[PDB]
């Protein structure tokens, strides 16, 4: 028995219970809630260290042997600081057969008490001391346009995409739609040679038979886009097929209000669960009250990253976007009126506050159509940074503990998108039984540049230097494709998500797919209350004239450390007893010019 200072302890194994580390260059702190190790028995690999034959590494058991409930792992990540919706804590991570097999204490049971996972002869060690480990992100709004989005997504901590498209065709440039058997097959065949988990959405329009055959072809869901016609029939019939096939539905609602207002769209849903893409509505959706979907229980509201940090440059950048996107000539009044009523600082600013409340549950990108696939995580924490700076600590948080806010925000791109598309049993969090999709971050780089990205226990992309160098940290130190992207390991370390009926149809043999196909499930039984930390349904109303977005007084309760009455003295009041959600745009953001060349 002896004593060690916390500074000397962190030098050896990383910080422990009660200590806090700053997330990147933001204003956020995470505090270690618990430590699953035993002090003095930490597992460390190196010359003359614990994990050696007979001392910390068991030397008798085989890879398939068991002692109690403990097993010999293929890979163990020692002293990992786990940041997850389940908690923020220190533990060893055990990986076996490409899945997370154990979270707890590693070592040799012959010499150490309470060993949950066994470091054996067939075990590889990754030293996670001093680094933060999170589950791989999910991007559920991706236009399938060019293959280089995959390395960019991995560079942003994204390990899974729910996409749709046909390549650089104008239909894909506008919508996330893989129309028909051919383009669903082509998407799955192309994904077969990319190191990412992928599922694809078909065209949710027309009668029942044309929609159904797309799902039988292997599509894991449907996207209803107004460019294909987001009418009442399309909403009703797409949901009818999806309930029969247990697949998700995403919608890009009618911006022109051509066949009804937002209430007409909601009525056509008839209580069936839908995924509201970019519910703020800058890039599309019922003008101007599409943001009101956050009040309905059968809607999973999602936001795209271009508007997520409300900044000084947002309005000017977005105003010019539509004039190019839809060839809006700034000389005809109709084009300007359609755009001036579509980019609203009122709803863009109110969107950030709703995220802090938990009214919007999912973060996405809208890859290469309106947003950025490599910045899903970065802009999520930028928004979390802005909310803390302007509204203080979230409810239950303290000076060096933003754990409640961190868990709420990390859920938006890890577990909530997984639940929405019915793949939460496979991915979306760092829990036992899930795929070993893990992203490592150095704390000074958290939310900007990951250290390595692991796909089912194998590193797919990581920071690495000169291959000729004596050590792997020599300039030029860049993010490089790893062994997980080569040979049969490429088709062993990622999966393709398909519908159950498509999988039962033998599309894997018909399409000659080499990857494993996993069926989506439980897509219809989930609703807003299923989302972790993001199940709020405030009474949000968008003023048809002033575009102001306001909530009730009780909707401001349990939000922040400051009570609703104090918040009532800062938010503007409408004629009714409602309070307008607003905040000044951000000028300087973290996870920004301090990190990125260009």
């Amino acid at each position: 028995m002896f004593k060690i200072s916390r500074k000397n302890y962190s030098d050896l194994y990383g910080i422990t219970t009660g200590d806090s580390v700053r997330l990147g260059d933001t204003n956020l702190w995470v505090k270690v809630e618990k430590d699953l190790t035993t002090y003095g028995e930490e597992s460390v690999f190196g010359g003359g260290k614990t994990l050696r034959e007979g001392m910390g590494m068991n030397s008798t058991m085989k890879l398939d042997d068991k002692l109690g409930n403990a097993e010999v792992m293929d890979l163990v990540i020692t002293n990992a600081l786990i940041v997850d919706y389940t908690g923020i804590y220190k533990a060893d991570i055990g990986i076996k057969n490409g899945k997370i097999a154990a979270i707890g204490k590693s070592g040799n049971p012959h010499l150490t008490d309470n060993v949950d996972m066994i470091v054996g002869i067939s075990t590889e060690i990754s030293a996670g001391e001093g680094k933060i480990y999170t589950a791989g992100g999910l991007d559920t709004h991706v236009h399938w346009l060019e293959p280089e989005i995959v390395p960019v997504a991995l560079d942003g901590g994204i390990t899974t995409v729910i996409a749709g498209g046909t390549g650089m065709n104008d239909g894909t440039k506008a919508t996330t739609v893989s129309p028909g058997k051919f383009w669903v097959k082509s998407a799955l065949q192309a994904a077969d040679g990319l190191s990412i988990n992928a599922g694809f959405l078909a065209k949710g329009q027309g009668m029942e038979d044309p929609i159904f055959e797309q799902i039988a072809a292997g599509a894991c869901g449907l996207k209803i886009h107004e460019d294909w016609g987001a009418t009442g029939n399309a909403i009703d019939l797409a949901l009818t097929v999806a309930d029969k096939t247990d697949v998700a539905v995403a919608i890009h609602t009618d911006t022109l209000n051509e066949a009804g207002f937002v209430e007409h769209t909601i009525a056509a849903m008839k209580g069936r669960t839908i995924h509201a893409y970019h519910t703020e509505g800058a890039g599309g959706g019922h003008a101007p009250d599409i943001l009101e979907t956050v009040k309905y229980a059968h809607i999973l509201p999602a936001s795209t990253n271009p508007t997520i940090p409300y900044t000084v440059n947002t309005i000017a950048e977005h105003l010019d976007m539509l004039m190019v996107c839809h060839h809006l000539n700034p000389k005809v009044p109709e084009d300007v009126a359609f755009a001036d009523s579509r980019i609203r600082s009122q709803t863009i600013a109110a969107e950030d506050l709703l995220h802090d409340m938990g009214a919007i549950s999912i973060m996405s990108s809208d890859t290469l159509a309106m947003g950025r696939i490599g910045e899903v995580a970065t802009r999520t924490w930028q928004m979390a940074h802005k909310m803390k700076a302007q509204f203080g600590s979230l409810k239950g948080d303290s000076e060096f503990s933003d754990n409640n806010r961190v868990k709420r925000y990390i859920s938006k791109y890890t577990i909530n998108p997984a639940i929405a598309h019915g793949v939460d049993s496979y991915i979306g969090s760092l829990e036992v039984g899930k795929l070993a999709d893990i992203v490592a971050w150095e704390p000074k780089f958290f939310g900007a540049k990951p250290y390595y990205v692991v796909k089912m226990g194998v590193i797919a992309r990581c920071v690495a230097g000169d291959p000729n160098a004596s050590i792997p940290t020599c300039e030029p130190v860049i993010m490089r494709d790893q062994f997980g992207t080569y040979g049969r390991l490429l088709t062993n370390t990622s999966v393709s998500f398909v519908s159950k009926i498509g999988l039962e149809n033998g599309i894997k043999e018909e399409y000659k797919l080499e990857k494993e196909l996993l069926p989506v499930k439980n897509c219809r039984s989930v609703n807003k209350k299923s989302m972790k930390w993001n199940s709020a349904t405030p009474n949000l109303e968008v003023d048809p004239q002033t575009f102001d977005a306001a909530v009730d007084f009780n909707d401001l309760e349990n939000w922040l450390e400051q009570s609703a009455s104090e918040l009532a003295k800062k938010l503007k009041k409408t004629s009714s007893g409602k309070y307008i959600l607003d905040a000044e745009p951000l000028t300087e953001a973290p996870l920004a010019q301090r990190y990125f060349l260009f």
Binding site: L12, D19, S20, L23, G40, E53, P109, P443
Partner: protein, 114 residues
């Protein structure tokens, strides 16, 4: 103050390693002409034969009866270095778990004798 990305804020208090595991103070002397260094979890009964042990009373222990089934009471992953001719006082604790040693120098390869 100065904005340090990834800064660490420490809690108040010290950390107790190997709590509840009473330690014994012994001596180890290197008699060889080359340096030796022993890790925290190495079975001390099986260290280099040039190391000579001295029990808690200071008397030499030729059969290493004080080192049987014990390891250094030092932070996990660290080590203790003995230069040629050097004699150090060290703290040791009994091994835990099922108390079996397999491998190392093959001197036990089974359950430690009770």
């Amino acid at each position: 103050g100065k904005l340090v990305p990834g800064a660490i804020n420490f809690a108040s208090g010290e950390i107790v390693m190997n709590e509840g595991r009473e330690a014994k103070v012994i001596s180890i002397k290197n008699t060889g002409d080359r340096p030796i260094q022993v890790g925290s979890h190495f079975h001390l009964f099986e260290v280099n034969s040039a190391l000579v042990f001295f029990d808690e009373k200071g008397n030499e222990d030729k059969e290493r009866k004080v080192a049987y089934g014990r390891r250094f009471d030092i932070p996990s992953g660290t080590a203790i270095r003995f230069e040629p001719g050097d004699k150090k006082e060290v703290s040791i604790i009994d091994l835990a778990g099922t108390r079996e040693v397999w491998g190392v120098n093959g001197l036990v390869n089974g359950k430690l004798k009770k």
